[PDB]
Design a protein around this motif. Structure first.
Motif, PDB file in Angstrom:
ATOM      1  N   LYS A  42       0.881  -1.202   0.000  1.00 53.25           N
ATOM      2  CA  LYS A  42       0.000   0.000   0.000  1.00 53.25           C
ATOM      3  C   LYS A  42       0.905   1.234   0.000  1.00 53.25           C
ATOM      4  O   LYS A  42       0.789   2.042  -0.923  1.00 53.25           O
ATOM      5  CB  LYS A  42      -0.955   0.000   1.203  1.00 53.25           C
ATOM      6  N   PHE A  45       2.901   2.033  -3.209  1.00 51.61           N
ATOM      7  CA  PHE A  45       2.040   2.313  -4.393  1.00 51.61           C
ATOM      8  C   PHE A  45       1.276   3.636  -4.218  1.00 51.61           C
ATOM      9  O   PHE A  45       0.802   4.178  -5.242  1.00 51.61           O
ATOM     10  CB  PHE A  45       1.170   1.096  -4.732  1.00 51.61           C
ATOM     11  N   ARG A  48       2.521   6.296  -6.474  1.00 47.18           N
ATOM     12  CA  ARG A  48       2.349   6.011  -7.923  1.00 47.18           C
ATOM     13  C   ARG A  48       0.884   6.205  -8.315  1.00 47.18           C
ATOM     14  O   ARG A  48       0.635   6.242  -9.520  1.00 47.18           O
ATOM     15  CB  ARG A  48       2.843   4.598  -8.245  1.00 47.18           C
ATOM     16  N   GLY A  49      -0.033   6.233  -7.331  1.00 43.59           N
ATOM     17  CA  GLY A  49      -1.386   6.819  -7.440  1.00 43.59           C
ATOM     18  C   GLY A  49      -2.445   5.799  -7.827  1.00 43.59           C
ATOM     19  O   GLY A  49      -3.383   6.160  -8.557  1.00 43.59           O
ATOM     20  N   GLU A  50      -2.307   4.561  -7.350  1.00 48.69           N
ATOM     21  CA  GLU A  50      -3.190   3.431  -7.713  1.00 48.69           C
ATOM     22  C   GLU A  50      -3.033   2.335  -6.661  1.00 48.69           C
ATOM     23  O   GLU A  50      -2.046   2.387  -5.885  1.00 48.69           O
ATOM     24  CB  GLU A  50      -2.810   2.917  -9.097  1.00 48.69           C
ATOM     25  N   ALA A  51      -3.982   1.402  -6.631  1.00 48.73           N
ATOM     26  CA  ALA A  51      -3.929   0.163  -5.822  1.00 48.73           C
ATOM     27  C   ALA A  51      -2.620  -0.583  -6.120  1.00 48.73           C
ATOM     28  O   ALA A  51      -2.295  -0.748  -7.305  1.00 48.73           O
ATOM     29  CB  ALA A  51      -5.133  -0.699  -6.130  1.00 48.73           C
ATOM     30  N   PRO A  53      -0.531  -4.008  -6.620  1.00 49.80           N
ATOM     31  CA  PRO A  53      -0.984  -5.259  -7.212  1.00 49.80           C
ATOM     32  C   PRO A  53      -1.216  -6.298  -6.110  1.00 49.80           C
ATOM     33  O   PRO A  53      -0.549  -6.235  -5.084  1.00 49.80           O
ATOM     34  CB  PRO A  53       0.162  -5.646  -8.158  1.00 49.80           C
TER      35      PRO A  53
END
Ligand SMILES: O=c1ccn([C@@H]2O[C@H](COP(=O)(O)NP(=O)(O)OP(=O)(O)O)[C@@H](O)[C@H]2O)c(=O)[nH]1
Ligand SMILES: O=c1ccn([C@@H]2O[C@H](COP(=O)(O)NP(=O)(O)OP(=O)(O)O)[C@@H](O)[C@H]2O)c(=O)[nH]1
Length: 326
Positions: A42, A45, A48-51, A53
């Protein structure tokens, strides 16, 4: 019952460490590092502005294959785990992807580290090796592991579950139990007699693959009861002799001499020589200690005193090998 069989089985009882499916403590230490990666991801990421993986974990190594041994006193055991990230391999750098995991775990126990073949996280008395894979469904149907360090770096074709299947499937029942005992015997021998220089020690995976190629069951079936008794000393003698028979003198142009080399190919992708990193001098030392072990297995067959037979083996297997009083 075969000569020294009772003492082999007592030695086995002392060195065995229960597999994941039989071992709550290992499942908890594993699952804690898995949680730590999810939460850790979490963080990485959020920049980087997203969920982050998602990943599918699976058991690897000795605690998956039921070939695990306790370390020597004040040594560490390694919990091995695979995580298959929901990523396309062609979209990411393997070291980049291993960096995510390292940074996810930076502040877990005594820190994380990027290794050639894994991210290792350190804790007291044990480390966890996370093999990092791309999704086969997203990577052209192949399972690829993240290989290489900062100081170096590819997605290599890997087949850990096929290796684990090969080890499980080679034999069944009590035959497969002797096979597993004989891997553990050589892992304790490895830990006891290669403690001066850990780099010189034959990898566990190499002893396991050697057993896959060369181990034969030794057992006798009574002409009357048809009752079956296993002979671990004889199984180990035949196995060690077969390994010694597969060393080949190999010319080295720099040193202008030959070294004896044992080549043990993985029976699955990538079919590499698991012993390829061992130097010629480390191989010569490996061969000489294997020969000394073979000599002790033969002496143990021939002694009139069980004390002397067991003492001859304890010299190679260390303090857990029972030596009955004379
Ligand atoms: O499928 C795999 C492959 C590899 N691994 C893990 O990779 C580790 C192999 O060890 P390593 O190759 O990652 N160590 P390395 O950085 O190359 O040492 P060196 O260059 O001599 O300084 C082992 O501990 C395995 O558990 C896996 O866990 N699963
Ligand atoms: O070269 C290889 C090939 C494969 N693997 C894969 O890595 C996993 C085991 O990782 P491992 O290197 O720790 N082998 P292990 O049997 O645990 O030795 P030991 O700790 O001494 O008892 C297995 O599930 C293999 O598929 C490697 O680690 N190295």
């Amino acid at each position: 019952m075969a000569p020294v069989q009772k003492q082999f089985r007592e030695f086995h009882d002392r060195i065995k460490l229960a597999q994941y499916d039989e071992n709550q403590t290992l499942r908890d230490e594993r699952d804690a590092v898995l949680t730590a990666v999810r939460e850790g991801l979490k963080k990485v990421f959020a920049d980087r502005g997203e969920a982050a993986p998602t990943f599918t974990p699976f058991n690897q190594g000795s605690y998956a294959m039921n070939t695990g041994v306790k370390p020597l006193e004040g040594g560490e055991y390694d919990i091995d785990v695979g995580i298959i990230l929901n990523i396309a391999k062609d979209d990411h750098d393997p070291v980049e992807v291993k960096k995510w995991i390292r940074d996810a775990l930076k502040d877990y126990g005594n820190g994380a580290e990027i290794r050639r073949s894994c991210v290792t996280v350190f804790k007291p008395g044990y480390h966890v090796d996370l093999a990092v894979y791309a999704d086969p469904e997203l990577s052209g149907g192949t399972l690829c592991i993240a290989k290489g360090k900062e100081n170096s770096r590819l997605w290599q074709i890997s087949d850990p579950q096929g290796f684990q299947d090969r080890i499980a499937s080679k034999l069944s029942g009590d035959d497969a139990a002797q096979f597993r005992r004989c891997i553990r015997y050589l892992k304790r021998w490895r830990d006891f007699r290669f403690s001066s220089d850990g780099n010189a020690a034959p990898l566990g995976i190499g002893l396991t693959a050697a057993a896959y190629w060369w181990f034969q069951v030794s057992k006798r079936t009574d002409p009357v009861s048809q009752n079956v008794t296993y002979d671990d000393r004889d199984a180990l003698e035949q196995f060690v002799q077969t390994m010694l028979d597969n060393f080949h003198d190999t010319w080295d142009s720099k040193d202008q001499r030959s070294y004896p080399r044992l080549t043990v190919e993985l029976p699955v992708q990538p079919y590499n020589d698991v012993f390829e990193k061992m130097t010629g001098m480390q191989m010569e030392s490996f061969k000489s200690k294997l020969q000394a072990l073979l000599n002790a297995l033969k002496t143990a067959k021939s002694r009139l005193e069980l004390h002397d037979a067991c003492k001859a083996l304890a010299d190679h297997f260390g303090s857990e090998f029972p030596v009955p009083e004379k």
